[PDB]
Amino acid sequence: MLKKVEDTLTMLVNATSRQNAAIEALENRLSTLESSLKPIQDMGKVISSLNRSCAEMVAKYDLLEHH
Amino acid sequence: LKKVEDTLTMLVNATSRQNAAIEALENRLSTLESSLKPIQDMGKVISSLNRSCAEMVAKYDLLEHHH
Amino acid sequence: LKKVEDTLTMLVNATSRQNAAIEALENRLSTLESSLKPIQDMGKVISSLNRSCAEMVAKYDLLEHH
Amino acid sequence: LKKVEDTLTMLVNATSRQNAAIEALENRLSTLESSLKPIQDMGKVISSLNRSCAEMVAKYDLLEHHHHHH
């Protein structure tokens, strides 16, 4: 009787452990997304500085203009 | 009854390891959400950049030849 | 004996909880993946924004020495 | 003797469902991964824009004092 059960239990332990692994494997896949982002984040900071640098030039012109 | 209880414990230690790997995986995800916020928010900055940079040319293209 | 049934039950509920936990996560992901179109769409705005600047540099370079 | 097999059969089904939950999460990731490639490529375009724009204002500011003074 017990044989099939000792066996079915050793199935699950192995399978669960397979999944544990699948999941650890999935986290690295994530950390690596998070860190490929950085270059993106950077470029955003560049667009922002660039918006400011323009807008500042308009302001500088609006005053120059009236002459 | 030994093997069942032995393996049934192998398994409980395996199932609670998974709880831990799942939690660990959310936190990477959660952290990944954060790190996109800057980027989603980006669409809006680009548009402002376009507007400002448009505006900056206007004020110069006209105002240039004018003086 | 009984400790074996009760320990199996405990397990089964704990795993269903993890299925839920995981399915949950996929939903969360898809939510993000949908967030990106709006940005990806801008890369075409950045491109005609570049072209337009480059052409101005071009114009002003020619016109400079003039 | 029974209840044990019954519940075992439940726990086999539930763990099998997870192989499938996990596989099904791998796919939504592999697709998130894909849709960023487009955005990393915007980065290339942004630096050249940052070049290109910065040069405009180089050719503004030089020609400003140079065709307004002369």
Residue B11's domain spans which residues? Answer: 1-67
Tell me the three-class secondary structure of A6-64, residue by residue.
HHHHHHHHHHHHHHHHHHHHHHHHHHHHHHHCHHHHHHHHHHHHHHHHHHHHHHHHHHH
Counting the structural domains of chain C, the total is 1
Q: Cβ of C17 under 8 Å from any chain D Cβ?
A: no
D27-47 core/surface letters (b: 16 or more CB in 10 A; e: else)? ebbeebeebbeebeebbebbe
Contacts of D56 (CB under 8 A, 6+ apart): B57, C53, C56, C57, C60
In whole angstroms, give the CA distance from residue D57 to residue C56: 10
Q: Cβ of B64 under 8 Å from any chain C Cβ?
A: no
Structure determined via: X-ray
- Cβ of D55 and C57 within 8 Å? yes
In whole angstroms, give the CA distance from residue D26 to residue C29: 10
Report chain C residues whose CB lies below 8 A from the CB of B1: 1, 4
Report chain C residues whose CB lies below 8 A from the CB of D32: 29, 32-33
In degrees, rounded to 5, the angle at the alpha carbon of residue B62 between the alpha carbons of residues B52 and A47 is 15
The resolution, in Å, is 3.2
C18-57 core/surface letters (b: 16 or more CB in 10 A; e: else)? bbebbbebbebbeebbebbeebbebbeebeebbebbbebb
